[PDB]
């Protein structure tokens, strides 16, 4: 397989709950593994503005995404957001890419500032310390001054800062070809396979 | 009236034309005065991207959108790429507000470096030393830290950084919904009443 | 009216319990809508330092402060920490000018860094990136250079850093009259009438 | 009116006192009212480089100002360099905006490192804590790097740097139509309205 | 005797001439020696808005100050804004620790910058050179960039930024109280024996 | 194959052509795709200074490199300046290592800045957002300050600034061997194989 | 002869046509070499608003302003703005003192970030290269942070910035007085002769 | 005579000792004084890899190169490298020219950093001291971000670093023409005449 074996795949309080279910039912299908974290605010985000009912709890939630997903068994492991004894706690564990998608201007604040007060936080606090893929999927408008810095600092470290900021150059028909747009950049970043966006300019010889 | 009375309105060579002609339609509809400026980037961006048909030269560009937003005769201004007789070339012009929708890396450049290579370069240049209203609505992603640094600096200096990264919190039904969250966003940093996006929690009186 | 229709008034667990009570009695004279938050340090503050007996629930609280400065119906909204749905947690909110009065040195970290923990840091954030107007008023001594860095980057993007630090030159002698002098200076900043505090030298003609 | 109805106009002792003099007596036209203030330099330069007479004692200048541009009782207030007394020595004064018009390079520098050892200096100390209007009118050449250090600082901090630099597209044929160049721009920073530097382009429809 | 044998005690023309008065008057009742400067503006601060009539000359000060603090004679030593033989403008001198209560923005700047325009200055120069304490009790507000910049560069060099912030968690029932609350926590700093102002939980033995 | 498929090939108007004909001819030997990119001035560079006759449009330079090189059909793709069809125009193509040889001083301001003015500039652009090889073999002499400066950013950011600066351990007799010297580098840096230049000390078993 | 035996000369697109011009003319006055440089906007400057009729092509121009300046015959030359065979476009050119008056603020930037898209901008790359003058005389007003940020860059490598600027104190008659006061100064950094502006005290002995 | 009469010439371990010797002997060739420094690092490099003998000890080599040269008596001195009592270890010393040609990483480091190990790094901790001219010729592929900072910190302290990166726009047809061309690029820069290298565009009159 081109690209990692396993993803952690965290989900915060930003607008855009669509790109992580959509990253993480692509992510399935290309049979990775995928460690899923998820934030209060980012249930709450789930809860009040789709319609996918994600239950509270790690254990039923990792039954549910592994239906809705149509996930192998244990391919998706979900842990809550105190558990260190996690893979992601430590940099012994087995290397992961680490995808924060949708990233809150405050997860963004932390990771920028090292601040560990859950396992979002940690598990890019050890991505970073390790030198494992990590990619921020930040979803704000406007970005004022302090967003930018810890962009750009963070950048400057080789994280991947990705806005939820879709083109329009696939001609896009629906919400869900914009969703997709961002899902495939984010798939091309981490080097895993993916069909929905074309290779622009692959069949251009001459100019 | 809340807000400016006339907007210079750049499209430079980003994807995301619709946003930059869905603006220029609601300030019309707020009945401002547009002085509008584009790149021939945009404009192949446009050619190529969407399947509106705009005229080349600047008097008959000028036709084309003043017909496509129901404008008002001289509503519209359009000017060329090297026209410095222009308003927006001046800061003894009467005062403008500025965005840049949708703005290119290379537009962003420019701008954060001071180059004046055409009209809309100059005229953010004009903004910038006037402190005159100055948006910028970039879409791309990856954001490289060359891009974040110069969002920065523009954000250190007052500039507005409103990337082309929409919400979802208004349930989204299609493309043109959209569109019209990062233009409902800008119209409120410009202080131009828009009806596209609820005021967060007005009603909520308390928690 | 000179000045905002609408302030967000957030106290937090530094001394100066008296400042924020006197700064929300005054903009409910003045007839301003007020989004009133407090921390659960500030709580502690209050009812360890002062005898006001202020009530732990939004509902009860708001209904306490109501009565405690003679407010209309409605005009004193009450947000508890991790309410998201209160206008302050989004910038598509109706615009108001944040004061948070008094400061701890947690909450000026908070705001420096971009951390969004709860709904006064999240409600600062969306201030600092909507450009609208917030004011901090730090109660601390000595300010160590972690304090002061916090300020000053604050203050370069255009916060306004407003030490609960009195002045005596109306010849104070109470300290109700020192703690006036500050509610003076942060309504004198926010553009709202005040008569607590004359216009230095307004009546000296000639020197 | 449009724009402040208080200006605190400080001279110091760059060369161009023409530019300070018309600068006043456009104020008085327009009805404002001005706290005028002048070095112990800007008088030696006005002495020994203009033809006006100006007297020594602020009541006494007083009244010479007043009579020269025609103003009305009590519309020109003069103030000495230690009167603390005067309205701009403190932020609980009135709100004006402040113009230093010339800037010598020494005040320049006073100012952006915070000396406030007369009360020009002051004065601009306080303009840039309450976020009044502060615009300096340097007259120097060459910039060294200390001045544009000096110069960069404040421009960050919203001072408006406007040098002494007059244009020639308004086909200039004397001295005074190059000072009221300068003195125009200054005018429209201000927010004032002027009459003597069209509006660029503004009868200019399409290119 | 914990603490300094001799503090140089600086007044400046900030408003709050009553901390400087009341520190002096601690000093002297904990039998340290005092050498005592005092700015013009200071002194005009004191006319203006004390009932203490300080005398002009530093003898018939000395005297005054002497009986005012019911100090021993000797106890306190008076020097002029420009005595460069008195102890605090050498190196070579005997160890003194340096406070300037109240420090005015303009001190704050004259000491961050290194200028050495009077005694007080100078002796500040002197104090940061030997790496003796000195520490600053600014009263401002709002407090600019400029005033934070000045602040954490001399922070980050060693000295004490001390704002004239007082606490309300003693219970203050006079301004009296709120002067001795900033007194308390000048003579903690200086290691200097203080009752005013308890120590905080030193009863308290387990949470 | 050891390093990468695709390789974008960008020639720019510094001296040394010789440089960037060795590399296309060196990795068409390895059977890599190449996209080839030329200014207009690296046109007037090798017309004026070398003796290869390149066709001015792509579609006969291709065939003229083509030809000049081996290459097989389709393996050198070349787009010219304004060409946005071109893959390297965006990052959702398939990925390629870019090399600007020769680099000259203008091209590399136009990357360190993020300057899109022609499909070099937008390619490198790109390469940076997504994190893809980017190699510059800049050839000035004396390098400035603004040339060192726009050298370390991009060094920072993974870029590798690889100048035309020949060693002479190889024994080199001829103008050719210092040419593959360079060639050999980039190669190196590239992960290619290449035979010009021996593994240093690779059969040097003790010291 | 003191200073320099050859003057780049590069006119840019702001307002001050006149300065170049009458440079132009005491640099030939002088004896000096002068390579002129012009930009299409500063042709369009001196077309639209000088009555200098200035020829488009390089050799009527050449001819044009010998006869303008009496010029000796190759006293003058012209280059077009892409002559790369121009001695300006090297360091291996004979050195020359380069002159950009009047500079645009786009030119500075180009200048300041090493941007070099046509001879003028790649002649100041390589004066400063090869440490040689480099004179800018900026036209400006206000001077943003951005114009500041690329002065003081300029400024700290040992460019002259000399903004055109000019002085009272021999007390102008006529817009030719203050043009020749900035021509005046420029002289004098360059180190040739002028009698346009007399030596400052230079028949002052005593104080 | 134009330029230095004394150049101080240190040969470091780099890779390109034949630029080195070259520049000697056109030094000689223009009867300047040379005092020759050279490393141990570099002795080894001229010793393996070029077929120039060099004596080990200072009196023997001053003797070889005396010779190989063709120089008179007294021309070239050598010193090694801990004779502090040779010139270049004090600025009290009669005024020299340095170049380090070639320049190796660490010596470059050395140089920067102002470390002092050698006469080779304690000679241009002199030149820089004095301001008197250092040429720095560093030779290496890539340059790491290590490299650049230094280059740039000496840089912008005046010092001239010139790669040994030849051009070929002379049309080179030997090793020995790629040499020489760095070799006149380092005499132009000292100001030593040289007729390797023609002066660009000095026939050329007109575009
Ligand atoms: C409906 C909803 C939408 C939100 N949308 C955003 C958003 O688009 N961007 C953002 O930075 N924060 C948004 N927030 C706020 C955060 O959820 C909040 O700052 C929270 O503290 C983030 O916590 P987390 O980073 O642990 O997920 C939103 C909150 C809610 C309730
Ligand atoms: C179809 C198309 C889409 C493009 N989309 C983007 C984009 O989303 N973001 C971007 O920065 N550049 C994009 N570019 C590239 C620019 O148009 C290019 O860098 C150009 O030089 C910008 O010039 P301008 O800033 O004058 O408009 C696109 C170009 C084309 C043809
Ligand atoms: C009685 C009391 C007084 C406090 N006074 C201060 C103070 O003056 N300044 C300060 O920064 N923190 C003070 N603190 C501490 C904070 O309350 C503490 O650091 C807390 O975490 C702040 O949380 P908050 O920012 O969410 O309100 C005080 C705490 C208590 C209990
Ligand atoms: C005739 C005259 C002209 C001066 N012109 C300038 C000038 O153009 N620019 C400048 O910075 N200083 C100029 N100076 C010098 C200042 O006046 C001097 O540095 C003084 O200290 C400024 O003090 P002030 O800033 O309190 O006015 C001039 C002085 C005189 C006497
Ligand atoms: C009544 C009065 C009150 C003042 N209060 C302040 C103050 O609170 N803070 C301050 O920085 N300056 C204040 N100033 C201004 C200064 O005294 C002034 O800037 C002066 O130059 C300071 O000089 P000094 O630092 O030598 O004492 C006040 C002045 C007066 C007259
Ligand atoms: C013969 C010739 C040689 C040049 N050699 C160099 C060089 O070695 N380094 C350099 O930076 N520029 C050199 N230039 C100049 C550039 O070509 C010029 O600055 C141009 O604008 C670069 O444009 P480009 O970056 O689009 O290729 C040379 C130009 C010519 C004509
Ligand atoms: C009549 C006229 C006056 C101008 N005056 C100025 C000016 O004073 N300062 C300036 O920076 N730009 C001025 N500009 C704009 C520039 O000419 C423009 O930004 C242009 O791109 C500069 O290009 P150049 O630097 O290649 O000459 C003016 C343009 C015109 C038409
Ligand atoms: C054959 C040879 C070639 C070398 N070439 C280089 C080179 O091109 N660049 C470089 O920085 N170091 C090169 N080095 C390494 C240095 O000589 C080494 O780092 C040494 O410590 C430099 O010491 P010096 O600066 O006192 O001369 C080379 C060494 C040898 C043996
Ligand atoms: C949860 C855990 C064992 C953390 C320690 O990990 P690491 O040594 O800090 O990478
Ligand atoms: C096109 C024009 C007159 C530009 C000059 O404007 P400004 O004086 O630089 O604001
Ligand atoms: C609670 C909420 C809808 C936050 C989103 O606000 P915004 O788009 O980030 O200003
Ligand atoms: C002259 C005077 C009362 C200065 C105090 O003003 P502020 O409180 O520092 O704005
Ligand atoms: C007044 C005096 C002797 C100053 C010299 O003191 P120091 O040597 O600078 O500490
Ligand atoms: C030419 C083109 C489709 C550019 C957009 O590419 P990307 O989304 O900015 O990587
Ligand atoms: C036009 C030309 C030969 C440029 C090369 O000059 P240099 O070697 O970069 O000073
Ligand atoms: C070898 C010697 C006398 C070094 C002292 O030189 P300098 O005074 O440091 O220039
Ligand atoms: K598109
Ligand atoms: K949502
Ligand atoms: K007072
Ligand atoms: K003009
Ligand atoms: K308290
Ligand atoms: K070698
Ligand atoms: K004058
Ligand atoms: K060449």
Same mark, same amino acid.
């Not at 915060?12 to 992580?20: L, M, N």
């Not at 921020?136 to 750009?152: D, G, K, Q, T, Y």
């Not at 990705?162 to 083109?167: D, E, I, N, R, V």
């Given at each position: 397989?081109?690209?990692?074996?396993? #993803?952690?795949?965290?989900?915060?309080?930003?607008?855009?709950?669509?790109?992580?279910?959509?990253? =993480?039912?692509?992510? !399935?299908?290309?049979?990775?593994?995928?460690?899923?974290?998820?934030?209060?605010?980012?249930?709450?985000?789930?809860?009040?503005?789709? $319609?996918?009912?994600?239950?509270?709890?790690?254990?039923?939630?990792?039954?549910?995404?592994?239906?809705?997903?149509?996930?192998?068994?244990?391919?998706?492991?979900?842990?809550?957001?105190? $558990?260190?004894?996690?893979?992601?706690?430590?940099?012994?564990?087995? &290397?992961?890419?680490? !995808? #924060?998608?949708?990233?809150?201007?405050?997860?963004?604040?932390?990771?920028?500032?090292?601040?560990?007060?859950?396992?979002?936080?940690?598990?890019? $606090?050890?991505?970073?310390? %390790?030198?494992?893929?990590?990619?921020?999927?930040?979803? %704000?408008? &406007?970005?004022?001054?302090?967003?930018? %810095?810890?962009? =750009?600092? =963070?950048?400057?470290?080789?994280? !991947? #800062?990705?806005?939820?900021? &879709?083109?329009?150059?696939?001609?896009?028909?629906?919400?869900?070809?914009?969703?997709?747009?961002? !899902?495939?950049?984010? =798939?091309?970043?981490?080097?895993?396979?993916? $069909?929905?966006?074309?290779?622009?300019?692959?069949?251009?010889?001459?100019?």
């Amino acid at each position: 397989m081109s690209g990692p074996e396993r #993803i952690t795949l965290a989900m915060t309080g930003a607008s855009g709950a669509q790109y992580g279910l959509r990253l =993480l039912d692509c992510l !399935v299908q290309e049979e990775r593994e995928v460690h899923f974290l998820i934030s209060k605010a980012a249930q709450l985000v789930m809860a009040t503005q789709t $319609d996918v009912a994600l239950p509270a709890k790690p254990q039923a939630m990792q039954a549910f995404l592994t239906e809705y997903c149509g996930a192998a068994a244990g391919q998706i492991r979900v842990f809550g957001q105190n $558990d260190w004894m996690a893979p992601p706690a430590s940099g012994s564990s087995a &290397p992961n890419a680490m !995808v #924060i998608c949708p990233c809150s201007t405050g997860t963004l604040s932390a990771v920028a500032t090292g601040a560990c007060n859950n396992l979002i936080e940690r598990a890019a $606090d050890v991505a970073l310390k %390790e030198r494992r893929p990590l990619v921020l999927v930040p979803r %704000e408008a &406007p970005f004022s001054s302090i967003h930018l %810095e810890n962009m =750009l600092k =963070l950048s400057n470290l080789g994280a !991947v #800062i990705l806005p939820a900021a &879709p083109g329009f150059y696939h001609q896009p028909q629906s919400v869900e070809d914009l969703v997709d747009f961002v !899902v495939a950049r984010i =798939l091309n970043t981490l080097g895993i396979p993916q $069909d929905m966006l074309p290779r622009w300019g692959e069949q251009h010889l001459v100019s």
